[PDB]
Amino acid sequence: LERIPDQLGYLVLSEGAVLASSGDLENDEQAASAISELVSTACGFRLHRGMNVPFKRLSVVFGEHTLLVTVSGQRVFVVKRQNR
Amino acid sequence: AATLEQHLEDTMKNPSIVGVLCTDSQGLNLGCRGTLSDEHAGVISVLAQQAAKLTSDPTDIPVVCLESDNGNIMIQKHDGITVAVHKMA
């Protein structure tokens, strides 16, 4: 079975605050604020259908890790994942 | 950064790429094709800028990807030029 890369931290936001966090993301107010802003913009973004958030996942890919962000609907779920 | 019209055209040649757009830190629509146009340029510029705040770069400039069932929009800054590409799956 396929090898899934390690998680490096989680963050759950429930506007505006940190509801839960662990690992690299634990009590990191700056990251939580910056994610919250990115997510609000991404959520407000429309391609060609007003009644459609044009993503099911937002991923921010860095050299060694990626932040995987899902929204529903006033909460934000973040996993920091090692790259494959 | 130098000319960029040629790159927009070559990129669109890919049969899954349905849109491309370049902006800067200001949100200037520096050229777009296909599915991405003026009303998208601003939000695209803001996203890249907001995503950059998620690191104090090890020279680690992120790619922002908005993933949908049908395709993806991939956004990266390089350099002072922000390039968004709309791909079908």
Numbering used by the authors:
A (entry chain A): 9 to 92
B (entry chain B): 2 to 90
Q: What do the study authors state?
A:
and the human pentameric Ragulator complex. RagB, promoting their GTP binding in exchange of GDP. the Rag GTPases, thus mTORC1 can be activated by the lysosome-located small GTPase Rheb.
α3-helix feature which are present in Lamtor2 and Lamtor3. between their α2-helices as well as β3 and β4 strands. β3, β4 and β5 strands of Lamtor5. -F63, -V69, -L76, -T78, -V79, -F85, -V87. semi-independent subcomplex, and so are Lamtor4 and Lamtor5. stabilized by Lamtor1, and by their assembly into the Ragulator complex.
